[PDB]
Amino acid sequence: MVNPTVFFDIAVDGEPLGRVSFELFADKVPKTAENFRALSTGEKGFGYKGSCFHRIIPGFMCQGGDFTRHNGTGGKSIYGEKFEDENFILKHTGPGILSMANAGPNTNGSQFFICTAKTEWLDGKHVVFGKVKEGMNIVEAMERFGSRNGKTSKKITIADCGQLE
Which residues sit at the interface with ligand L89, rule CB under 6 A? 72-73, 75, 101-103, 107-109, 111
Tell the smallest beta-carbon distance from residue 114 to ligand L89 (Å): 15
- Quote the CA–CA distance of 36 and 132 in Å, as a whole number: 13
Shorter beta-carbon distance to ligand L89: residue 89 or 103: 103
> What are the phi and psi torsion angles at 143 (to 5°)?
-70, -30
Tell the smallest beta-carbon distance from residue 17 to ligand L89 (Å): 25
Tell the smallest beta-carbon distance from residue 113 to ligand L89 (Å): 10
Catalytic residue among 54, 55, 67, 111: 55
Look up 111 and say whether it is catalytic: no
Q: Which residues face 57 on adjacent strands? A: 61
- Quote the CA–CA distance of 17 and 39 in Å, as a whole number: 21
Tell the smallest beta-carbon distance from residue 99 to ligand L89 (Å): 11
Q: By Cβ distance, which residue is nearest to ligand L89?
A: 109
- Quote the CA–CA distance of 131 and 99 in Å, as a whole number: 8
Shorter beta-carbon distance to ligand L89: residue 12 or 54: 54
Q: Comparing C-alpha atoms, which of 146, 160, 153 is closest to residue 113?
A: 146
Shorter beta-carbon distance to ligand L89: residue 23 or 66: 66
Shorter beta-carbon distance to ligand L89: residue 11 or 101: 101
Contact between residue 61 and residue 114 where contact means Cβ atoms under 8 Å apart: yes
Which residues have C-beta within 8 Å of that of residue 96, sequence separation ≥ 6? 114, 115, 131, 132, 136, 139
Look up 122 and say whether it is catalytic: yes
Which residues are identified as catalytic? Answer: 55, 60, 63, 102, 113, 122, 126
